[PDB]
Each structure stands twice: as C-alpha cells, then as structure tokens.
C-alpha cells in the first residue's frame, strides 16, 4: 500500500523547497543552490531540479549535486603574465588573479588587472568588466648614461 518516500536530505551547499515532515505520494520538492553554485547530475549540468514522490515510495530522479561555479582558466594576456593570488591554479568562485604585463617594457591600461571569478562564470575586473586588460608599449628607455 501507500508509503512515504525516503526522506530527501539536502545535498551539500543546496537548499530544499518546500520542507515537509515527511513526503508522501505526489509530494514534490526542488533544490536551490546557494549563490555561487550550479546544479549538475553527473558531469552534465541541470537548469533546475524537481522530483516527485511516485508509487511504491520511489523518486523519479536521483539526487543532484550543488557544485561551485568554475570560471575556468584565465585567458592569456598578450605580452603579459597571469598570477594566481588565491592559490595554485584555483579558478573557482571568488578566486582572485592578478594580471601583469611584462615589466619595464610594457605598461597596463584600461584597468589595473585585478580579476575575481564572478557567480556567472566570467572573470570580472575590479571595475566590473569581463574583458581582458590591454598592455601598452613604454616608449623611450634608452641605455645611454
């Protein structure tokens, strides 16, 4: 006969809606990750998750996972280098990188090169721009004494 579906414990960094003492046939729930996390099943992403308690106390979908947003590798800078401030090769949400044009011979324009990984998956500067900085040649600089 009718039974309660297994209790849906929240995945890490995810929140359940709506909360119920027990989930009976035809009750449903949805998972909403905290800001900076995305829904994924296996390695494939999910736009949104919603499951419903079906007959014999079984769910239609397996549990997903709230994974932190990854901005990916920083785009390389012409005549410049990229430095990881947060840690070696960490590109996840709220991580900071510092762009630097090659010293002495080049100077930076537009912005100062401090970029942080934003919740939308794009590296954003301190000003809020998503595009790369530009390195400008430094004229002059003769070796005469």
């Amino acid at each position: 006969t009718a039974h309660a579906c297994p209790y849906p414990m929240a995945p890490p960094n995810g929140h359940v809606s709506p909360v119920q003492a027990k989930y009976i046939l035809k009750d449903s729930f949805s998972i909403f990750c905290e800001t900076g996390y995305e829904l994924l099943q296996g390695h494939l992403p999910l736009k949104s998750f919603t499951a419903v308690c079906q007959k014999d106390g079984s769910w239609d979908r397996p549990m997903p996972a709230c994974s932190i947003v990854d901005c990916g590798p920083p785009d390389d800078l012409p005549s410049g280098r990229v430095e990881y401030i947060t840690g070696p090769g960490v590109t996840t949400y709220k991580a900071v990188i510092q762009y630097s044009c090659e010293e002495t011979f080049y100077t930076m324009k537009v912005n100062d090169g401090k970029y942080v990984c934003e919740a939308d998956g794009f590296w954003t500067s301190s000003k809020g721009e998503k595009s790369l900085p530009v390195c400008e040649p430094v004229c002059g600089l003769s070796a005469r004494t």
């Binding site: 994924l40 390695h43 992403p45 990854d70 901005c71 990916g72 590109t91 998956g121």
Partner: protein, 145 residues
C-alpha cells in the same frame, strides 16, 4: 579552437557534418607527434587514439600511426603534443609503410579536444557534454539514425 561555436552552427552541428554534409567517410581521434615540411605541403605525423568510423582504412586502431597533410596556402596548423578530432573523406595516397594518407581540406573537420581543466568550466561544461555525447553516439551507432 576547442568547443568553439560558429555563427551558423546550430545544435547538432557535429552530427550534421558527419552524416548529412559533407558526410564524413572516416572519423579519428589522433595525437599530433611531429610536423614535417614537404614541397608545397605541411605533413603532420600523428598517432591514432580513438577510432569512430572508417571506410578504406581497414585495421585502423589505437596506437596506429597515420599522416595528415594540408596545403601550404591554408592557415591551419596542427601543433604537436595536442589531441585533435579529425574526420573527413579518405584520400588516394599511401605512406612509406603502406598506410593511407589524409588530406585536410574544407570537407574535413578538425577540432582540438578540450583539456580536463577547460571542460569542467561552467561555461563550457554544457558544450563539452555535447561533444562527448556526439563521440559516443557516432562512435557506436554511426550514421544509422
């Protein structure tokens, strides 16, 4: 470059290229070993890592080596050490060991396969899933849709 969408590339573009137009006759996944310069042609010595489809190239398998040529006029360049998905139509020439050689032209599909760090990025995770889903779909069931 890896997972780059053309302006006219609608969804399922890889399957349309492979099975509708120009209808691929061979589909390989190779790793570029070395580049040689011949008369009016550039020669890339490659090692096959995965085989998706073939017609004339019987006993083509992993760790088998092939030769991929492109005219010197074309702006395509295959840098050694990277892994590419190559599919097109089989040529008419053979190499020193007796294996067929391949010409890369407008009816050939060349795309570097994404690295592990890039593929799990939030932006490219959905696109990287389409590529692997296509490789498993085409590599198993072919064009018999």
């Amino acid at each position: 470059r890896a997972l780059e969408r053309g302006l006219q590339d609608e969804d399922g573009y890889r399957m349309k290229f492979a099975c509708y137009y120009p209808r691929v006759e061979y589909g390989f996944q190779v790793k570029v070993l070395r580049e040689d310069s011949r008369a009016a042609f550039r020669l890339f010595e490659t090692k096959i890592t995965q085989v998706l489809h073939f017609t004339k190239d019987v006993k083509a398998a992993a760790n088998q080596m092939r030769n991929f040529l492109v005219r010197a006029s074309c702006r395509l360049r295959l840098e050694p050490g990277k892994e590419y998905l190559i599919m097109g139509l089989d040529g008419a020439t053979y190499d020193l060991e007796g294996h067929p050689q391949y010409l890369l032209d407008s009816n050939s599909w060349i795309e570097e396969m994404p690295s592990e760090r890039l593929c799990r990025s939030t932006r490219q995770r959905a696109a990287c899933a389409q590529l692997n889903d296509f490789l498993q779909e085409y590599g198993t069931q072919g064009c018999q849709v």
